RNA sequence: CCCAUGCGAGAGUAGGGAC
RNA sequence: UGCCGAUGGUAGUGUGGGG
């Protein structure tokens, strides 16, 4: 099972997102179901290595944010236009 | 082009549909 | 441009600064 550690974002928007990426992290979003969407931030390198395995995109993953696990599937990924980096990820609740 | 701050598409995604 | 349509990200951008 893939276990991803994340934190809830304290700020959003272009400025905040660029700050994260300049600091070796990147934004992501968890949506789906009855609960409201949850905007989170991830460690770039750790997730990048994880998603290098094809199962990352087929399996139900576990994101540890706050203190509980959420159970999601990768729904979409935005990659840098010309750099080997992850820009954003959509996670859908499972 | 970048930073701070405010504003924020187009496309696509979740979801919905008496079609 | 052919049904409606979030959230987040992206483009662009007002103000101030940097270059
Ligand atoms: Mg700005
Ligand atoms: Mg739109
Ligand atoms: Mg749209
Ligand atoms: Mg449907
Ligand atoms: Mg938006």
Give the domain ranges of chain A. 1-94
- Burial (CB < 10 A; 0-12, 13-18, 19+), residue A59, is middle
Listed resolution, Å: 1.8
- Signed CA dihedral, A32, A18, A49, A40: sign only: negative
**CA A1, A77, A50: angle at the middle one, nearest 5?**
30
* Cβ pair A56, A73 in contact under 8 A: no
Q: How far apart are CA A50 and CA A11, in angstroms?
A: 26
- Burial (CB < 10 A; 0-12, 13-18, 19+), residue A39, is middle
| Fold entry, domain A1-94 | Ribosomal Protein L25; Chain P (2.40.240)
Cα distance between the two ends of chain A: 14
* Cβ pair A79, A86 in contact under 8 A: yes
- Sequence-distant (6+) residues with CB within 8 A of A1 are A59, A61, A62
What's the A81 CA to ligand 2 centre distance in angstroms?
21
Chain B bases closer than 7 angstroms to a protein Cβ: 2-8, 12-15
């Amino acid at each position: 099972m893939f276990t991803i550690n994340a934190e809830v974002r304290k700020e959003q928007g272009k400025g905040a997102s660029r700050r994260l990426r300049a600091a070796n992290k990147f934004p992501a979003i968890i949506y789906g179901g009855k609960e409201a969407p949850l905007a989170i931030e991830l460690d770039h390198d750790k997730v990048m290595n994880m998603q290098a395995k094809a199962e990352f995109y087929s399996e139900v993953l576990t994101i540890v944010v706050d203190g509980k696990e959420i159970k999601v599937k990768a729904q979409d990924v935005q990659r840098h236009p010309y750099k080997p980096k992850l820009q954003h990820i959509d996670f859908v609740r499972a």
